[PDB]
């Protein structure tokens, strides 16, 4: 298991524009196109992201290219962020993947706001961090995914993803 396989499980793969859990236009492996309610605004963002007139459909290779870009942007984003970099540097490799997963889903600003959870992760208080992370809109809105990410921070193993 690695971050790519973990996110593929959590996000799925869809080659036509769809709406995510929040109702936003998305494509591929969790690639948000726009928060706008217009399908035409979403098709324009998609064509710009891919570099051709797609008419709302992409290939598997194009979805994987967007995914590679998005993972790389999440990692570079964490490492440029003064609040997240210290947390990332403190963690083992499995727990680093759980932090990337959260940034990929929420964005850097959303994760930097989990102030108390950050501090507990930096202190290696795994069970206390797990409890604090679950007291969130994130957990209440996507509990199965959140439970897998929380388990990963609690244990430092891939157990929540093995058998999927
Ligand atoms: S959650 C962002 C964050 C990380 C850490 C370095 C522990 N910081 O004290 C805050 C809480 C800003
Ligand atoms: Cl879920
Ligand atoms: Na998704």
CATH code assigned at 92? 1.10.530.40
Where in the sequence is the domain holding 33, given as residue range(s)? 3-155
Q: What was the elucidation method?
A: X-ray
3-state secondary structure of 17: strand
Contact indicator for 98, 106 with CB cutoff of 8 Å: no
Structural domain count of the chain: 1
- In our burial notation (b when 16+ CB lie closer than 10 A, e otherwise), range 108-125 reads beebbebeebbebbeeee
Residue 91: CB within 6 Å of ligand 1?
Answer: no
CA of 141 to the centre of ligand 2 (A): 7
- Is residue 161 a part of any domain in this protein? no
**Residue 164 belongs to some domain of the structure:** no
Residue 119 lies in a domain: yes
Q: How far apart are CA 120 and CA 116, in angstroms?
A: 6
Q: What is the resolution of this structure in A?
A: 1.6
Residue 65, in any domain of the structure: yes
- Rounded distance, CA 28 to CA 90, Å? 32
- 53 annotated to bind ligand: no
Q: Is residue 91 part of a domain?
A: yes
């Amino acid at each position: 298991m690695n971050i790519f396989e973990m996110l593929r499980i959590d996000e799925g793969l869809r080659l036509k524009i769809y709406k995510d859990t929040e109702g936003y236009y998305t494509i591929g492996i969790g690639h948000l196109l726009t928060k706008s309610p217009s399908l035409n605004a979403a098709k324009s963002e998609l064509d710009k992201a891919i570099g051709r007139n797609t008419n709302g459909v992409i290939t598997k290779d194009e979805a994987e290219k967007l995914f590679n870009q998005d993972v790389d942007a999440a990692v570079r984003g964490i490492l440029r962020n003064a609040k997240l970099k210290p947390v990332y540097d403190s963690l083992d490799a499995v727990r680093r993947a759980a932090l990337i997963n959260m940034v990929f889903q929420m964005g850097e600003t959303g994760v930097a706001g989990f102030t108390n959870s950050c501090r507990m992760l930096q202190q290696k208080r795994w069970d206390e961090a797990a409890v604090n992370l679950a007291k969130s809109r994130w957990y209440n809105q996507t509990p199965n995914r959140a439970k897998r990410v929380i388990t990963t921070f609690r244990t430092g193993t891939w157990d929540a993803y093995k058998n999927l």
